[PDB]
Amino acid sequence: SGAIYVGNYRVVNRHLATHNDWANLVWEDSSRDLLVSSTTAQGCDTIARCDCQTGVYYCSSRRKHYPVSFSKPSLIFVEASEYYPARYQSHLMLAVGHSEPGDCGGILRCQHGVVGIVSTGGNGLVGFADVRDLLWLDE
Ligand SMILES: NC(=O)[C@H]1CCCN(C(=O)C(F)(F)c2cnsc2Cl)C1
Ligand SMILES: [Zn+2]
């Protein structure tokens, strides 16, 4: 559960995208687990334009926000799921912290804004799909 709303855009996990998201599709990237779609109401979230490696993420399965140190966006191997076969997912950031499948979509933030969304997890690790490079979300 969870999405980012910036201007006339809505970013979600591509594996959790709805029929409306696909019928108003702007861009989608299987290797990043991302999909952006068109909205009529204007969004108000600020996206970060930085290279921080500390922030705060929201965890639905614990109803608690947590502070984390996280890695730089890179190619990490992700286990086969009902949505994708075993593959390398690009632009992924890892941190020590609790996550369960229903937690995908929770936002990661630093003092500059929205950094990304929960996208992978397991064994006491949590993975975030980076969004700071998508400069067109602001224009
Ligand atoms: N980005 C991916 O390929 C996702 C697809 C859905 C499945 N993915 C997961 O990691 C998970 F839901 F099983 C999970 C398990 N414990 S915490 C999380 Cl998040 C990978
Ligand atoms: Zn930052």
User: Domain spans of the chain?
Assistant: 3-44, 45-139
How far is ligand 2, taken at its centre, from the CA of residue 55, in Å? 8
Q: Which ligand is nearest to the CA of 92?
A: 1
Q: Which ligand is nearest to the CA of 80?
A: 1
Q: In whole angstroms, give the CA distance from residue 32 to residue 130.
A: 8
Q: Does the annotation place 110 within a ligand binding site? A: yes
CA-nearest of 15, 8, 12 to 36 is 12
Which residue owns the Cα nearest ligand 1 atom 9?
120
Resolution expressed in Å: 1.7
- How was this structure obtained? X-ray
Q: In whole angstroms, give the CA distance from residue 128 to residue 139.
A: 23
